[PDB]
């Protein structure tokens, strides 16, 4: 079959390459259509459906059967915010920022946003809570690295906000998720592990300043945390990156501010 | 989980199938050997 | 700031023996030690490993293949440990010479041992594929890993088995040995003109670079939104949090389109599968349908003349 | 030879039968290919020579 | 032109340069100062490629090629028809890549997520600069860079490889190839695993991460976790690019002969250099 | 030799029998291939030369 | 041969029938290609020869 | 042959019909290309010879 | 005993049947080797 | 030599027996291949020379 | 007792294992004698 | 030399014994291969030349 | 414990000396057959 | 810790001893096998 051509220069190799181009176009179509399951249909900046909806149509609905009797999810489907957004459009035309109206960190807008998730704890395969405080988790102990318990927590303004009382751990993965920090007032909040730099002397939190440590949301039960509370706490701490920049006591940031 | 009677019946049928397959194989080998012996 | 590359504290507790449905726990072995060195990066626990019928078959076949090549390497060294260490990379288990074609009449020292080792490798790889499919089926999951492995197996078979049959000689296959198979690829290129001008070779390279690009993008995205617990991707698929939304909006504001917490994995599996798929097709065409890829490119508008 | 039925008290018939089918087909293909490899017993080439098809 | 949830994230701030001069969106895209720069550089580069096609005379996209200046121009400039267009297009491409990375930084800041993605892109930018800027400058001419053609930079790859015999005998190259292959394997495994967990057998409930860890401990006896596998993917891809850049920075610069001669050092070690038998000796 | 039955108090028969089957088939294939490699005992070529096939 | 129906108490017909269809088509294609490979039985080239086309 | 309708109690008609359409078109294209490859039955070249188009 | 649960009688019966099969296999192998040695001795 | 039984208070018999079987088969194969390598003791070639099979 | 066997179980297991070992060794010895008679290596 | 037993208060016997077995077999194989490499002490060739096998 | 270590080491050294005795007799036989000094 | 240091020490001692023995064997002198063969007229 070497050198034989049906027409022109077209032969087995050309047939293969052209069939592959057709297949590749079909596959790109299919993959994008699969990627159009969340966040669609498109909205206007006020809330009404848009004039432009995309060259790719929406896909057929599919259903996920969640575990432990949590129910079923249907996507794509009717999706709504299920919360009020505290923003005001800065300009009439489309495609401009919406400024916050009150306190962005409390309103939950911008980088400090959160999604109204399910108000239930996360469950592992067996049916127990996936995240537990270590003192209530039987057999768990720090294995290596600097132990953070008992170390003072320092805010981004170089002032001590409290002391670490406990570690929350993911039971299946056996990796620490949250630190529990007790403030001067005696109440205890949570901080994600990904936001703290456990140093030799202290746990350093560059996201939040000390005065803002009281503003973190709290949990209903001391022995569990739900997805919604997780979302609120994580959004608060992360939005502290942008919305606590003035209080942040950074040398280079101060030099840049003086420059500008 | 199979009981003795079930095992005996299953083995009887399986051996019947095995012997049918072996008979067909034997006639095929005889035909080939007649056509072109390998010894 | 903490970049989440390495864990800064390790905790350990009772070992997780795993889920139990439609799975025979007798075959599952015992939990091995906890390795702190790996605990810095990911999970520290080793095992338990399922050792089924196909597991034993695959282990036996792979052990025999490895040991066969080792014994031939020893014979090639004069059974000298010093020479064996000095020429470990330079040894070879060459396929039968073109004189014998596809025949099994090659002497054991010039082609028979290669056929025996090839049979062992064939059995080992196919038994391992069956093992992957069966392990997915035991837990009730989908068989996606089986099909990606099937793509890899397709390229492997074309390299070692199907293409020699089409060409009509066992000498076309790949010799076992490090520098031996590197030289095999270089000679395969030189014989068939530039393999660069193979269009399916180009597509295979495109999807390999794409695999690297997509895995870098996805790893960076998930590490960047892990501060919102984005690494729990199955939970995000179940109940879309702010991690998925922030990732999607980053990519949408960057390049005009985005994926979901599930579809990006469809992109990943296809960008990885197409590498071996197109590579197998291109290798299969070479020699069988085209004998000079540079001239083919010249005739198809790719090369200047 | 009578008590061989007790093997079915050891092995589930489903797995054994699947493995048997795969093994038998694999062995048959292997032997046919081995015969096709040798210049003799390559029935295709033998019969091409027999009737002077070339 | 907004996603169902995009509204609450479109807020001012998080921009390195320009205040709110370019803090606006065009359709889905986010413009920004560096977005303006990226658009300018990209448009200029593409039009200059088209114009170089006009000068070359061919309108076939696969034959269009923008060669760098010959070796006789050294590291200096060249006429636009015979070398200058390549240099202008290269400056445009470098500017576009850098501006794209910085625009990604701005978007990360506005969304409050970590800066892993522009950092990862910086590795690809550095590999490109090694091939186009660092290695030719080190070696002494712009004629050692590659042409900007679809099938003609493969000619550069082939010629540069075969200048040193079989390029497979390059150790910083072997490591990079093994990293690329491991990365493709890891990507396939990870995508397939998450898909099989999220799309289980027909009629069954969605599986949990516990099932994933159980499956991979059943298969090979070790599971790296979810955070582990994403860390590993990032590290493998970055390491592959890093070692490829190293392999091309030491080639023709501190090593000039065939690359198998390098591997000759291990053979010549004193305590087996002279023993007879084997492949080598 | 009488007490060898006690080996079945050590090993599950399922695993042992699977391993035995795999091992026996592997060994048989290995020996047949070894015989096929040598110019003698390569029964295919021996019979080809005996009946003057080529 | 009468009791062979009991195989359907072992295997779901859906999977068995899908596998059977795939296997039969694959085998038919393989055999047709093998015939097309040999200069004889390459019915395309035989007929071209017979009716004096080229 | 009468009971073949029961195949539709095994397979969803949608998937079967899609697969059938794809397979039939693929097979038809394959056979047409095979005919176009051979110098005979390459109806384009046969006819161009017939009416002296060159 | 407790490793897999079989009792003494079960083990004895299983071993008897297994040894019967082993001796049948060995007998077939022996006749095959005799036939080969007669056809083409290797000593 | 009497107290050697206490080794079974150290090692589980299952793992030890599996390792022993694998090791013994591996060693036997290694020694047979070593003998086959040398021109002498290559019983295949020694016999082929003895009976003039060449 | 890392594996849980008692003294009697260990003694019985060792007795049977040594019986098997001596059977294997006897077969090996007769094989080596046959080979040495056929073709000595000393 | 009397107090050497205290080493077993440091090392688990299982790991130590496994490592010891592997090491001893590896060393024995290494030394045998080294002897086989040299033209002298290559007992195979010393015998073959002594009894005129080549 | 100390007693368990003592007993284990007694058995271990007994086995070690058995192995070394076999090794010594092997070396002696070889040296008679073909010396290396 | 005794464990890691003892394992590393054992591995390193064994490797160093093998290295020195191979160095001795490699040289035409000190190859006790070769000089012994030459001494007693073995080849
Ligand atoms: C007429 C004009 C036509 C023009 C065409 C124009 C358009 C072209 C584009 C077409 C669409 C693009 C592709 C769609 C992608 C997603 C579809 C999908 O996988 O399932 C969707 C969907 C299920 O997907 P899911 O939601 O993720 O899984 C949920 C399940 O509950 C639980 O999951 P699951 O356990 O059921 O598994 C789901 C799926 C998951 O798979 C994946 O997502 C990854 C796939 C990676 C590549 C697959 C293997 C690559 C093979 C390499 C080459 C062959 C090697 C074989 C021999 C090797 C040794 C020699 O795995 C499968 O079983 C799918 C088949 C893959 C195995 C095919 C092996 C033989 C291929 C022979 C080639 C000839 C084509 C035959 C097509 C066979 C169709 C049955 O479909 C179904 O509901 C029914 C299941 C079977 C549907 C088959 C659809 C085709 C899929 C493969 C197509 C490509 C085959 C490779 C050859 C490529 C040739 C160039
Ligand atoms: C990396 C080491 C070598 C090199 C070696 C090779 C080899 C070898 C091959 C390619 C191939 C390609 N290379 Mg190159 N390539 C180099 C540098 C580059 C640069 C650059 C800015 O430095 C670019 C843009 C490209 C671009 C390209 C594409 C034309 C093509 C497919 C790549 C792909 O899909 O990747 C993965 C990326 C994606 C899937 C994302 C989408 C990328 C799109 C398609 C890029 C289009 C660029 C467009 C033409 C520019 C205007 N190469 C350097 C010099 N490249 C392959 C080919 O088929 O060439 C014909 C091929 O075989
Ligand atoms: C001078 C040399 C030639 C050349 C010769 C070839 C040849 C020849 C081939 C490639 C192939 C490939 N080349 Mg090229 N290549 C050249 C230049 C390049 C350049 C470059 C920048 O210049 C690049 C980036 C590439 C890149 C690529 C890859 C895209 C592709 C291999 C995919 C793969 O994963 O294969 C490797 C993956 C596998 C082999 C899959 C293995 C799966 C099996 C199941 C694994 C079993 C494991 C076994 C049992 C052991 C396990 C042991 C333990 C259990 C762990 N080539 C030049 C032009 N290249 C291949 C291809 O597809 O080409 C179309 C190919 O065959
Ligand atoms: C999409 C294609 C990529 C791919 C995919 C892939 N490979 C896979 C899989 C997948 C999806 C598996 O599920 C399977 C696996 O179990 O991975 C952990 C496998 C696998 N890919 C493997 C290797 C491998 N994959 C490679 C490549 C690739 N794999 C492609 C880039 C390469 C290369 C580039 O050379 C290698 C060496 C193994 C890790 C594993 C298959 C293991 C196997 O077959 O084992 C049988 C053989 C033995 C047991 C011999 C053992 C010898 C000694 C005892 C040691
Ligand atoms: C870790 C390194 C891997 C990687 C990472 C990576 N690349 C990335 C990212 C990351 C993490 C991004 O965030 C960024 C992105 O946004 O992707 C969508 C990007 C990106 N990786 C890209 C491609 C790409 N990455 C590649 C490689 C890889 N990228 C590495 C393997 C390759 C190749 C050759 O292997 C390609 C082709 C783009 C899709 C995108 C950056 C897009 C960009 O820069 O846009 C601005 C520029 C233009 C729109 C056009 C400029 C045109 C020029 C002026 C002309 C150039 C001509 C050319 C030289 C011709 C060659 C023929
Ligand atoms: C878990 O998370 C994840 C997701 O999210 C949930 C994701 O989606 C993704 C993102 C990945 C995908 C969406 C999958 C598809 C992506 C690939 C296969 C990678 C290949 C990508 C491309 C080749 C696309 C490249 C497109 C580009 C570069 C668009 C270029 C646009 C311009 C040049 C113009 C930009 C406009 C500007 C600058 C402003 C206009 C200018 C004015 C002056 C006005 C990842 C990784 C992920 O991890
Ligand atoms: C940079 C160049 C991009 C080239 C890709 C072509 C896609 C442009 C179509 C489009 O959506 O334009 C938006 C505009 C705005 O309309 P629209 O596309 O946003 O309408 C709503 C979106 N849909 C319908 C998919 C839901 O489209 C047009 O105004 C023209 C309509 C069709 C005319 C197309 C002419 C361009 C063809 C050149 C292709 C080469
Ligand atoms: C200001 C003061 C006066 C000018 C000083 C310039 C200092 C340059 C440093 C040394 C350079 C040199 O050695 O000159 C001799 C060389 C001539 O080298 P040569 O070819 O004669 O080789 C021998 C070199 N000697 C003799 C010294 C050993 O000229 C160059 O190096 C030219 C390269 C520099 C071009 C810089 C471009 C800047 C664009 C912005 C950067 C963005 C990257 C875009 C990609 C670029 C692609 C074109
Ligand atoms: C180079 O030379 C080579 C290597 C090629 C030669 C190598 C040769 C050796 C290594 C190959 C070995 C071959 C031997 C070992 C294979 C022998 C296989 C035998 C066992 C064939 C068995 C066939 C069994 C037949 C197919 C049985 C089929 C079953 C029937 C369909 C009936 C089943 C119905 C069931 C039992 C229903 C019963 C249900 C209950 C309720 C009663
Ligand atoms: C000291 O340790 C010892 C020596 C004891 C053991 C160590 C051994 C080491 C030295 C082993 C080294 C092994 C080498 C390094 C492994 C290299 C493997 C190479 C790199 C693989 C490269 C290519 C593999 C090709 C693609 C193989 C493809 C397989 C084919 C698809 C299978 C085809 C099967 C057919 C030919 C079977 C035909 C014969 C039967 C009877 C029909
Ligand atoms: Fe993921």
Domain ranges of chain H: 5-51
Are C42 and E228 an interchain contact pair (Cβ–Cβ within 8 Å)?
Answer: yes
Number of H helices, E strands in chain B: 1, 0
Nearest to E5 by CA among G16, A41, I41: A41
Residues A123 and A99 in one domain: no
Are I43 and J43 an interchain contact pair (Cβ–Cβ within 8 Å)?
Answer: yes
- C114 vs C91: CA distance, rounded Å: 13
- C258 vs B18: CA distance, rounded Å: 59
Cβ distance C267 to A31 under 8 Å?
yes
DSSP per-residue letters across chain H: -GGGGGGGGTS-HHHHHHHHHHHHHHHHHHHHHHHHHSSSS-HHHHHHHHTT--
Which chains have 3 or more CB–CB distances shorter than 8 Å to chain C?
A, D, E, F, J, L, N
C-alpha of E100 from chain center: 14
C-alpha of E94 from chain center: 13
List residues near ligand 7 (CB under 6 A).
A 52-55
- K17 vs E140: CA distance, rounded Å: 75
Are K10 and J11 an interchain contact pair (Cβ–Cβ within 8 Å)?
Answer: no
Cβ distance C170 to E160 under 8 Å?
no
Supply H44's token pair: 């384009």
Nearest to A240 by CA among A102, A108, A97, A105: A105
Task: For chain F, give the number of residues.
Answer: 54
Q: Which atom of ligand 6 is nearest to the CA of C219?
A: 48
Cβ distance C291 to C192 under 8 Å?
yes
User: Can you give the C-alpha Rg of chain I in angstroms?
Assistant: 17
Residues of L in contact with J34 (CB under 8 A): 36
> Which experimental technique did the depositors report for determining this structure?
cryo-EM
Nearest CA in chain L to M19: L24
- E129 vs E125: CA distance, rounded Å: 6
Supply I18's token pair: 């297994």
The full set of domains in chain E, from first to last, is: 1-163 (1.20.85.10), 164-263 (1.20.85.10)
Q: Which atom of ligand 5 is nearest to the CA of E41?
A: 54
A253 touches chain C (CB under 8 A): no
- C264 vs A36: CA distance, rounded Å: 11
Range of the domain at A49: 12-116
Query: Is the C-alpha dihedral spanning G9, G11, G15, G16 positive or negative?
Result: negative
- L36 vs L52: CA distance, rounded Å: 19
Other Cβ atoms less than 10 A from the Cβ of A81: the count is 14
C-alpha of C105 from chain center: 32
Range of the domain at M24: 1-37
Find the DSSP H helices in K1-42: 7-38
Number of H helices, E strands in chain E: 9, 2
Phi, psi of A144 (to 5 degrees): -160, 170
Other Cβ atoms less than 10 A from the Cβ of M28: the count is 10
- D48 vs G45: CA distance, rounded Å: 14
L11 touches chain K (CB under 8 A): no
Q: Which atom of ligand 6 is nearest to the CA of E36?
A: 43
Nearest to F38 by CA among C111, E204, E257, A199: C111
Nearest to A168 by CA among C221, C231, C229: C229
**All residues at 6 or more sequence positions from C3 whose CB lies less than 8 Å from its CB, including other chains:** C223, E114, E116
Cβ distance C202 to C196 under 8 Å?
yes
> Which residue has the least CA distance to atom 8 on ligand 4?
C149
Task: Decide if A100 is inside a domain.
Answer: yes
* Burial class of residue C187 (count of CB atoms within 10 Å of its CB; 0-12, 13-18, 19+): exposed
Supply H23's token pair: 């397979």
Are I21 and D4 an interchain contact pair (Cβ–Cβ within 8 Å)?
Answer: yes
C144 is in an annotated binding site: no
Q: What is the DSSP letter of A7?
A: B
CB of C161 shorter than 6 A to ligand 10: yes
- E52 vs E86: CA distance, rounded Å: 9
For the CA of E206, the nearest ligand: 1
CA distances, E92 to each of E77, E124, G9 (Å): 16, 16, 70
Nearest to L32 by CA among E279, H50, C206, J34: J34
**Domain total for chain M?**
1
Let me know if chains C and H touch, i.e. at least 3 Cβ pairs under 8 angstroms.
Answer: no
DSSP run (H or E) holding A131: strand A131-133
Place of tokens 């015939």: G35
Are L11 and N6 an interchain contact pair (Cβ–Cβ within 8 Å)?
Answer: yes
C-alpha of I3 from chain center: 25
* Burial class of residue E200 (count of CB atoms within 10 Å of its CB; 0-12, 13-18, 19+): buried
Q: Closest CB to D44: pick one of G10, G11, G38.
A: G38
**All residues at 6 or more sequence positions from C301 whose CB lies less than 8 Å from its CB, including other chains:** E60, E62, E63
- H24 vs C128: CA distance, rounded Å: 35
Q: How far apart are the first and last CA of chain L?
A: 53
For the CA of C272, the nearest ligand: 4
**All residues at 6 or more sequence positions from J32 whose CB lies less than 8 Å from its CB, including other chains:** none
Q: Which of L19, L24, L44, L47 to mutate to test the interface with J (most CBs of J within 10 A)?
A: L44
Find the D45 Cα to ligand 2 centroid distance in Å: 48
For the CA of E202, the nearest ligand: 1
CB of A30 shorter than 6 A to ligand 1: yes
C-alpha of L39 from chain center: 20
Supply I43's token pair: 């000593």
Cβ distance E151 to C302 under 8 Å?
yes
Cβ distance A98 to E11 under 8 Å?
yes
DSSP per-residue letters across C24-48: -TTTB-----B-HHHHTTS--BB--
- C252 vs C260: CA distance, rounded Å: 11
Are B37 and F43 an interchain contact pair (Cβ–Cβ within 8 Å)?
Answer: no
Are L41 and N33 an interchain contact pair (Cβ–Cβ within 8 Å)?
Answer: yes
Cβ distance N34 to E275 under 8 Å?
no
Q: Which of F5, F7, F31, F46 to mutate to test the interface with I (most CBs of I within 10 A)?
A: F5
The residues facing A71 across adjacent strands are A66
- A219 vs A188: CA distance, rounded Å: 10
Q: Which atom of ligand 9 is nearest to the CA of C104?
A: 1
Find the C257 Cα to ligand 6 centroid distance in Å: 6
Nearest to M33 by CA among L43, C120, J13: L43
Nearest to A110 by CA among A127, A89, A143, A87: A87
**All residues at 6 or more sequence positions from A159 whose CB lies less than 8 Å from its CB, including other chains:** A209, A210
Q: N1-40, what's its fold?
A: Light-harvesting Protein (4.10.220)
Q: Which of A73, A173, A241 to mutate to test the interface with E (most CBs of E within 10 A)?
A: A173
- C274 vs C277: CA distance, rounded Å: 5
Residues A78 and A38 in one domain: yes
Q: In this structure, are strands A203-205 and A152-154 parallel, antiparallel, or unpaired?
A: parallel
Q: Tell which one of C127, C137, C152, C267 to mutate to probe ligand 4, the residue whose CB is within 8 A of the most ligand atoms.
A: C152
Nearest to E27 by CA among A90, A45, I39, N37: A45
For the CA of B24, the nearest ligand: 9
Cβ distance E216 to E193 under 8 Å?
yes
DSSP run (H or E) holding I39: helix I8-39
Find the A54 Cα to ligand 2 centroid distance in Å: 29
DSSP run (H or E) holding C274: helix C263-285
User: Can you give the C-alpha Rg of chain J in angstroms?
Assistant: 20
- L36 vs J34: CA distance, rounded Å: 10
Task: Decide if A257 is inside a domain.
Answer: no
**All residues at 6 or more sequence positions from A130 whose CB lies less than 8 Å from its CB, including other chains:** A121, A122, A123, A124, A170, A171, A172
Q: How far apart are the first and last CA of chain D?
A: 54
User: Does the N-terminal peptide bond of residue A76 adopt cis geometry, omega within 30 degrees of 0?
Assistant: yes
- E19 vs B21: CA distance, rounded Å: 85
- A105 vs J44: CA distance, rounded Å: 86
- E108 vs E97: CA distance, rounded Å: 17
Resolution in angstroms for this experimental structure?
Answer: 3.5
Q: C-alpha angle H14/H17/H21, rounded to 5°? A: 140
CA distances, J28 to each of A255, J33, J34, J47, K28 (Å): 77, 9, 10, 22, 11
- A253 vs A260: CA distance, rounded Å: 11
Q: In this structure, are strands A175-182 and A98-100 parallel, antiparallel, or unpaired?
A: unpaired
Let me know if chains N and I touch, i.e. at least 3 Cβ pairs under 8 angstroms.
Answer: no
**For the domain bounded by L5-51, which CATH number is listed?**
4.10.220.20
DSSP per-residue letters across C162-223: IHHHHHT-GGGSPPBSHHHHHHHHHHHHHHTS-GGG-HHHHHHHHHHHHHHHHHHHHHHHHH
Q: What is the DSSP letter of D50?
A: H
The residues facing A63 across adjacent strands are A74
């Amino acid at each position: 079959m070497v050198g034989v051509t049906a027409f022109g220069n077209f032969d087995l190799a050309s047939l293969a390459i052209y069939s592959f181009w057709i297949f590749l176009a079909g596959l790109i179509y299919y993959l994008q259509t699969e990627n159009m399951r969340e966040g669609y249909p498109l909205e206007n900046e006020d809330g009404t459906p848009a004039a432009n909806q995309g060259p790719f149509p929406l896909p057929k609905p599919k259903t996920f059967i969640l575990p432990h009797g949590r129910g079923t999810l249907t996507v794509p489907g009717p999706e709504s915010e299920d919360r009020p957004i505290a923003l005001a459009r800065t300009a009439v035309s489309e495609g401009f920022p919406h400024a916050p109206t009150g306190d962005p960190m409390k309103d939950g807008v911008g980088p400090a946003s959160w999604v109204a998730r399910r108000d239930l704890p996360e469950l592992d395969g067996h049916g127990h809570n996936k995240i537990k405080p270590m003192k209530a988790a039987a057999g768990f102990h720090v294995s290596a690295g600097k132990n953070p318990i008992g170390l003072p927590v320092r805010g981004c303004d170089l002032e001590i906000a409290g002391k670490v009382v406990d570690i929350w751990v993911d039971i299946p993965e056996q990796m620490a998720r949250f630190l529990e920090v007790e403030l001067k007032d005696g109440s205890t909040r949570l901080l994600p592990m990904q936001m703290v730099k456990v140093q030799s002397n202290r746990v350093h939190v560059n996201a939040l300043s000390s005065d803002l440590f009281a503003g973190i949301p709290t949990i209903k039960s001391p022995t569990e945390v739900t997805l919604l509370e997780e979302d609120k706490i994580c959004g608060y701490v992360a939005g502290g990156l942008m919305y606590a920049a003035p209080k942040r006591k950074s040398v280079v940031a101060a030099m840049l501010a003086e420059y500008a | 989980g199979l009981t003795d009677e079930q095992a005996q019946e299953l083995h009887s049928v399986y051996m019947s199938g095995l012997w049918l397959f072996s008979a067909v194989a034997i006639v095929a080998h005889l035909a080939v050997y007649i056509w072109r012996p390998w010894f | 700031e903490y970049q989440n590359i390495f864990s800064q504290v390790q905790v350990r507790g009772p070992a997780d023996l795993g889920m139990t449905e439609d799975v025979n726990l007798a075959n599952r072995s015992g939990v091995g030690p906890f390795s702190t060195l790996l605990g810095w990066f990911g999970n520290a626990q080793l095992g338990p490993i399922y050792l089924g019928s196909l597991g034993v078959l695959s282990l036996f076949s792979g052990l025999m293949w490895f040991f066969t090549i080792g014994i031939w390497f020893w014979y090639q060294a004069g059974w000298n440990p010093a020479v064996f260490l000095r020429d470990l990379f330079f040894f070879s288990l060459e396929p039968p010479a073109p004189e014998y074609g596809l025949s099994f009449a090659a002497p054991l020292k010039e082609g028979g041992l290669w056929l025996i080792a090839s049979f062992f490798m064939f059995v080992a790889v196919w038994s391992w594929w069956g093992r992957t499919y069966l392990r997915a089926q035991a837990l009730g999951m989908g068989k996606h890993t089986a099909w990606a492995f099937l793509s890899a197996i397709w390229l492997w078979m074309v390299l070692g088995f199907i293409r020699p049959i089409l060409m009509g000689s066992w000498s076309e296959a790949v010799p076992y040995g490090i520098f031996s198979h590197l030289d095999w690829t270089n000679n395969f290129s030189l014989v068939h003109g530039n393999l660069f001008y193979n269009p399916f070779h180009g597509l295979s390279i495109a999807f390999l670079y794409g695999s690297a690009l997509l895995f870098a993008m996805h790893g960076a995205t998930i590490l960047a939104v892990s501060r919102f617990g984005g690494e729990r991707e199955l939970e995000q698929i179940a109940d879309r949090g702010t991690a998925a939304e922030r990732a999607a909006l980053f990519w949408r504001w960057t390049m005009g389109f985005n994926a979901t917490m599930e579809g990006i994995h469809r992109w990943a599996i296809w960008m990885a599968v197409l590498v071996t798929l197109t590579g197998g097709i291109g290798i299969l065409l070479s020699g069988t349908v085209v004998d000079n890829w540079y001239v083919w490119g010249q005739n198809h508008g790719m090369a200047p003349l | 030879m009578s008590k061989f039925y007790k093997i079915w008290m050891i092995f589930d018939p489903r797995r054994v039968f699947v493995a048997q089918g795969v093994f038998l087909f694999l062995l048959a293909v292997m032997i046919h290919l081995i015969l096709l490899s040798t210049p003799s017993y390559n029935w295709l080439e033998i019969s091409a020579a027999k009737y002077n098809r070339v | 032109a907004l996603l169902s949830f995009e509204r609450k994230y479109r807020v001012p701030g998080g921009t390195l340069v320009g205040g709110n001069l370019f803090d606006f969106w065009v359709g889905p895209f986010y413009v920004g100062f560096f977005g303006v720069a990226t658009f300018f550089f990209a448009a200029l580069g593409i039009i200059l490629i088209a114009w170089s096609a006009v000068l070359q005379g061919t309108w076939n996209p696969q034959l269009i090629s923008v060669y760098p200046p010959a070796l006789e121009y050294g590291l200096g400039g060249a006429p636009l028809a015979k070398g200058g267009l390549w240099q202008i297009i290269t400056i445009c491409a470098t500017g576009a890549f850098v501006s794209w990375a910085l625009r990604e930084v701005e978007i990360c800041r506005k969304l409050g997520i970590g800066y892993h993605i522009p950092f990862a892109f910086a590795f690809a930018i550095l590999a490109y600069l090694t091939l186009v800027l660092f290695r030719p400058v080190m070696m002494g001419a712009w004629g050692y860079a590659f042409p900007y053609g679809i099938w003609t930079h493969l000619d550069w790859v082939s010629n540069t490889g075969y200048t040193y015999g079989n390029f497979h005998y390059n150790p910083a190259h072997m490591i990079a190839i093994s990293f690329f292959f491991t990365n493709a394997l890891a990507l396939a495994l990870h995508g397939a695993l998450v898909l099989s967990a999220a799309n289980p057998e027909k009629g069954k409930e969605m599986r949990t991460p516990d099932h994933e860890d159980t499956f991979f401990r059943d298969l090979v006896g070790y599971s790296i976790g979810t955070l582990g596998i994403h860390r590993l993917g990032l590290l493998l891809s970055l390491s592959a690019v890093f070692f490829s850049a190293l392999c091309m920075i030491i080639t023709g610069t501190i090593w000039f002969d065939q690359w198998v001669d390098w591997w000759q050092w291990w053979v010549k070690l004193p305590w087996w250099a002279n023993i007879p038998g084997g492949i080598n000796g």
